[PDB]
Structure 1
Amino acid sequence: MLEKVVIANRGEIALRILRACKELGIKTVAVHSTADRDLKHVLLADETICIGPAPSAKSYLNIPAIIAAAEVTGADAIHPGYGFLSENADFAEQVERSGFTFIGPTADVIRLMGDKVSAIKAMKKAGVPCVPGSDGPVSNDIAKNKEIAKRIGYPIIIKASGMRVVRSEDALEESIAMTKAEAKAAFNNDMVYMEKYLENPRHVEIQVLADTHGNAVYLAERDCSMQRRHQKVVEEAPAPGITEEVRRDIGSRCANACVEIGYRGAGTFEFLYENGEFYFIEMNTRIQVEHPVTEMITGVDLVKEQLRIAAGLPISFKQEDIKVKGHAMECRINAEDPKTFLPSPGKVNHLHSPGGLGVRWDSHVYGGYTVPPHYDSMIAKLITYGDTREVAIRRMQNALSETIIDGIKTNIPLHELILEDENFQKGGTNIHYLEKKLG
């Protein structure tokens, strides 16, 4: 089965994967850039290989170097984590062709859901609800396009398979002409469609697992609406307002979609959720940053399941075994200025991480560690669990109050502002809320 895994990532998720591997007795190979020799998981790994200099392009995105690392160590499998190459179908393809197991879906499935028109087509076919839209690429005939846009109803948004919002017919012809011409020079792909622009939605996403035994399960949902410039700040599970009846409906549709498309591994169906209706926007064909809140409310170890699935085993439980219990919250702690959001690299002179009942800390940072400039700014994920949403929130507030990260700036002050916001405490704020509140 899986005896040795290359962890083709860094930071916190690399450590999360290492922990899962070690629990399963799987040997680890940490591939790393020159700037990441001091990463906690590298220091804990069974074997280490330097795959390039600091810049991501030369290291964590270096496909030949990563595959060569699997070859020399006689590894069986490669775990891409999230970001980097995790949704690069060329990578997945090269990994399998080279005789290693890619811990993720097949390349064909990555490419399928990597294209928005084809992803949407497959979801429609599978019975997953989608944003009303052109359903297919848009013509050049502006007459047909004004007809379609009128059908859908303004405002619409033009999107390449990057986006442009149109609130009247007055503007439709140019808007389609530009998004098409600017999306064709950016990525030799002039294909664009239109769909309804939802002005007041939440971000609600369904976690799935699918195995090579033909099983697929849903693991409730997460609300990730608390965002700034499309970057998630706080996530929670379950999503406030979502009943078990609604959960079973949408969840079961996502599970069926997995089987229809030949899905394998962990994945997430993202929806815009508005006026009680779900509308599909994307499938992330990988583990995600915010997976821990789902773990806390379902009792599933999502990274362990990824490894078991990749080894050819069935998912370790059945749908009927999963029941949402309690509530969980996650704050993404970033090394950045809490007001300008400019990164804040440098030496963590002192770290004090919080603890106690219902507090989980997923972080590679340690006292004496230097946060490098070269990658993203996430340094920790603080996760709380409680019997109710109110308890999870209070526990997060207290845990943040205990957290000390000296020597660099963090966004802890932003989390504190969010957690004490009366609207957030009520729950169900939309994806625009944080930017509105920040001014």
Structure 2
Amino acid sequence: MFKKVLVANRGEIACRVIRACKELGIQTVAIYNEIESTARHVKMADEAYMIGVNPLDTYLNAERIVDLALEVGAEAIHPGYGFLAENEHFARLCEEKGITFIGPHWKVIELMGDKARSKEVMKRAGVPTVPGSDGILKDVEEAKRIAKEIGYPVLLKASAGGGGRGIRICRNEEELVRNYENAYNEAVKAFGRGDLLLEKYIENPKHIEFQVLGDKYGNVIHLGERDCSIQRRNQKLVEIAPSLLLTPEQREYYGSLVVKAAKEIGYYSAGTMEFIADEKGNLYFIEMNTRIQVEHPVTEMITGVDIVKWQIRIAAGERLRYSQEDIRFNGYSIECRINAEDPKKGFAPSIGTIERYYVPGGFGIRVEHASSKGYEITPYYDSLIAKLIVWAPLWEVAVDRMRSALETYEISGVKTTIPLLINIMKDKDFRDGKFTTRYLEEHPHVFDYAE
């Protein structure tokens, strides 16, 4: 077990890691920028060092961080999420200097950081991806055949022109033909080459993600899935575990598949496979995060597994003491991001100073936060004030508990997402499990609230 760990992060995730280390009996080192000399994670660590020439260089200067670790005798670095956590060169430099990086091997971080090289890994493991042409379409006949084979609707896009002159949705064969001609000709005009690619169109999808955890001896489990469809611009606002979409059979089927894929690339530590999903529970792989997920607590609440503490144990060489048979899914857990942003104005950040600040607690309530009165939201760092997490045996009780917790979470000095989140908990569609990404676009009333 490590004697000292350095947390190359800030805010709530630094406090989460620091708490896991203290529980393990591990000494901790924090890093900070001078504009946050009073930061909570600084007070919580056994040792703290101001480094960096500006607020971001503190957390992004790989060489400065590995060097500080060597100076102060830290055997391992936890990177949290964001900043350098999925930076293969930071992980490689840790290994080269004899410091253990708490995460997957640097070669896996590099592998899964590339979109298409990630898609192929998952295809080769048997993890479903979005179907479509296996490159350029030979002709219109083949487009008709393939569209028939993967199911309408589908997308046609020109192959040339770097990005894309514009994608066309085709709902039936007739539309496929018209759109094939129009796109072929517009692409001859624009780039000189009419060749088209085809893709299955997943309309109005949900965001569903699976959690994996592996030790450095090939033992790898899944911790079921989360639904994080309630998001704007790919920023998640509400995350639930498990999904309401999937049955136990689907859950173990896809879970088995991501375990299979993780084993084939030699994954260890924590990781997440994010998918889009249709109404029927068909999932398609989009991307993998090779780090702790922000919303990992909801998975912790329903499985009993302490993911961060197991990252640290795994990095130190311990075996994962679980078989998949041990992993059970009990009740439901909801997490809401309490952000300093204004949902009535496009979620514009609300920089300022927290004045009133009362944290909720109770049966089934957990708070991940690093704020008190006087906490300053600067433009340098993300807008997150707190993650409010609840657990209950029944979905509806979980919703009521999250509503009642939010209604008691008092924050003044900045605008927050709390009133919007309360409206979501009170919304009939949300209570009935009916939401996709796009939930917010399709429910504008949740933006109606007092000042």
Q: TM-score scaled by structure 1?
A: 0.90
Distance (whole Å) between structure 1 residues aligned to residue 388 and residue 283 of structure 2 = 28
Q: Find the counterpart in structure 2 of residue 409 from structure 1.
A: 415
1:65-110 CA deviation, whole Å, 9 max, x = no partner?
1111111111111111111111111221122112111111111111
Distance (whole Å) between structure 1 residues aligned to residue 114 and residue 156 of structure 2 = 17
Q: Find the counterpart in structure 1 of residue 106 from structure 2.
A: 107
Q: Find the counterpart in structure 2 of residue 344 from structure 1.
A: 350
Distance (whole Å) between structure 1 residues aligned to residue 385 and residue 257 of structure 2 = 35
Q: Find the counterpart in structure 1 of residue 12 from structure 2.
A: 12
2:264 is matched with which residue: 260, 271, 274? 260
* 1:148 to 1:380, Cα distance in 2 relative to 1, 3 A: farther
Assess if the C-alpha contact under 8 Å between 1:359 and 1:385 holds in 2.
yes
Assess if the C-alpha contact under 8 Å between 1:33 and 1:54 holds in 2.
yes
Distance (whole Å) between structure 2 residues aligned to residue 62 and residue 147 of structure 1 = 52
Q: Secondary structure at 1:241's aligned position in 2? A: coil
1:21-60 counterparts in 2 under 5 A?
21-56=21-56, 58-60=57-59
| 1:317 alignment partner AA | Y
Computing the radius of gyration from Cα coordinates, the structure with the larger value is: 2
Tell me which stretches of 4 or more aligned residues in structure 1 moved more than 4 Å.
138-154, 157-164, 170-178
- Structure 1 window deviating more from structure 2 (400-409 vs 193-202): it is 193-202
How far did residue 328 of structure 1 move? 0.4
Aligned-residue identity in percent: 49
1:323 is matched with which residue: 325, 328, 336? 328
How far did residue 33 of structure 1 move? 1.7
- Structure 1 window deviating more from structure 2 (337-346 vs 145-154): it is 145-154
Q: Secondary structure at 1:205's aligned position in 2? A: strand
Distance (whole Å) between structure 2 residues aligned to residue 175 and residue 305 of structure 1 = 54
Assess if the C-alpha contact under 8 Å between 2:81 and 2:291 holds in 1.
yes
How far did residue 211 of structure 1 move? 0.6
Assess if the C-alpha contact under 8 Å between 1:220 and 1:247 holds in 2.
yes
| 2:254 alignment partner AA | I
1:227-278 CA deviation, whole Å, 9 max, x = no partner?
1111110000010031111111110111111111110100011111113211
1:234 is matched with which residue: 234, 238, 243? 238
1:131-161 CA deviation, whole Å, 9 max, x = no partner?
10345xx459888996897565653276999
1:299-378 counterparts in 2 under 5 A?
299-340=304-345, 341-378=347-384
| 2:243 alignment partner AA | A
Assess if the C-alpha contact under 8 Å between 1:338 and 1:412 holds in 2.
no
* 1:162 to 1:214, Cα distance in 2 relative to 1, 3 A: same
Gaps of 5+ in 2: 170-178, 446-451
Does residue 94 of structure 1 match 2:93? yes
- Structure 1 window deviating more from structure 2 (412-421 vs 165-174): it is 165-174
How far did residue 434 of structure 1 move? 1.4
2:404 is matched with which residue: 383, 398, 401? 398
Assess if the C-alpha contact under 8 Å between 1:35 and 1:53 holds in 2.
no
2:284 is matched with which residue: 260, 276, 279? 279
Q: Find the counterpart in structure 2 of residue 434 from structure 1.
A: 440
Q: Find the counterpart in structure 2 of residue 169 from structure 1.
A: 180
Q: Secondary structure at 1:402's aligned position in 2? A: coil
Assess if the C-alpha contact under 8 Å between 2:137 and 2:143 holds in 1.
no
Q: Find the counterpart in structure 2 of residue 188 from structure 1.
A: none
Distance (whole Å) between structure 1 residues aligned to residue 86 and residue 243 of structure 2 = 26
Distance (whole Å) between structure 1 residues aligned to residue 424 and residue 238 of structure 2 = 9
How far did residue 373 of structure 1 move? 1.8
Distance (whole Å) between structure 1 residues aligned to residue 443 and residue 9 of structure 2 = 34
- Structure 1 window deviating more from structure 2 (112-121 vs 259-268): it is 112-121
Q: Find the counterpart in structure 1 of residue 174 from structure 2.
A: none
Distance (whole Å) between structure 1 residues aligned to residue 188 and residue 106 of structure 2 = 32
Gaps of 5+ in 1: 181-191
Does residue 123 of structure 1 match 2:115? no
| 1:166 alignment partner AA | R
